[PDB]
Symmetry: C3
Subunit: 113 residues, 3 copies
């Protein structure tokens, strides 16, 4: 029934992804700053004449509770606006939610978003 869509994306794509989501009626979301490691190349930094590799790079995590019937549309909006063609574009996880409660009213399920 309700699903959590969790996307890890490049920080510079947050504005285009969130504008495309709100334009399609998906305004609600929680956003957090994280770091990610993958196949993308780490960054090279210098310290006292030595170079070192930084393997964890800044990323953005977007979390959205949506009804299952909207999952594929949210996925397609995030993919179209987050992809760049280069390694490090990110992932999207779909995780089951067994209950959504709106703190303010106590509404649940679709009435809670």
């Amino acid at each position: 029934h309700m699903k959590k869509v969790e996307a890890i994306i490049r920080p510079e794509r947050l504005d285009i992804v969130k504008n495309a989501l709100s334009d399609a009626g998906y305004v609600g979301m929680t956003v957090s700053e994280v770091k990610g490691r993958g196949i993308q190349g780490g960054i090279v930094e210098r310290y006292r004449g030595r170079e070192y590799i930084v393997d964890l790079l800044p990323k953005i995590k977007i979390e959205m509770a949506v009804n299952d019937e909207d999952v594929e549309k949210v996925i397609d909006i995030i993919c179209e606006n987050a992809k760049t063609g280069e390694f490090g574009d990110g992932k999207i996880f779909v995780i089951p939610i067994e209950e959504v409660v709106r703190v303010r009213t106590g509404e649940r399920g679709n009435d809670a978003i």
Copy 2:
């Protein structure tokens, strides 16, 4: 069996919510700073004579692994102490956990909390 309770709430309510949870025996939790977007009004900021809307506002995320039988009590404690009547009070997600392991001992399930 084990569930993850994930609550998004106003930052100024973190102390009252966490005191009410520990008073009821729910001490364990992970807390993180996030930003949220919803029906609540964004904030107005000024920069070089122009006003701009900030749509992502500071929120607090609380995560708690609890046994299913305690979920409704944890939900009610968070709702009573996090609600204010105004838009932006937040959400509570209940997500299945298929395994909980305590790093220190290797205990699992209820012995892992």
Copy 3:
């Protein structure tokens, strides 16, 4: 099929845990800074002649999408390298993922990691 491994661990153990994971072929992960409360003792701080207890302590959250068949190996790698014997070593949650999408290509499931 696909599972999310989410580990809460001491910040000073992040390097040893992530080196042991990459050495075993598990490079991909998302890392975030959080605070945690549990049975471990809070910290004592002083402010204007008074002492106060800080109950929420810095922790590190590691998230990894893995195929179910690798979950127990990832758990054992995290436990061996994150445990210290003292209270506050952390937890590991295994959460179902119903869909993993690689933003860059649109690949899913095992081809998405």
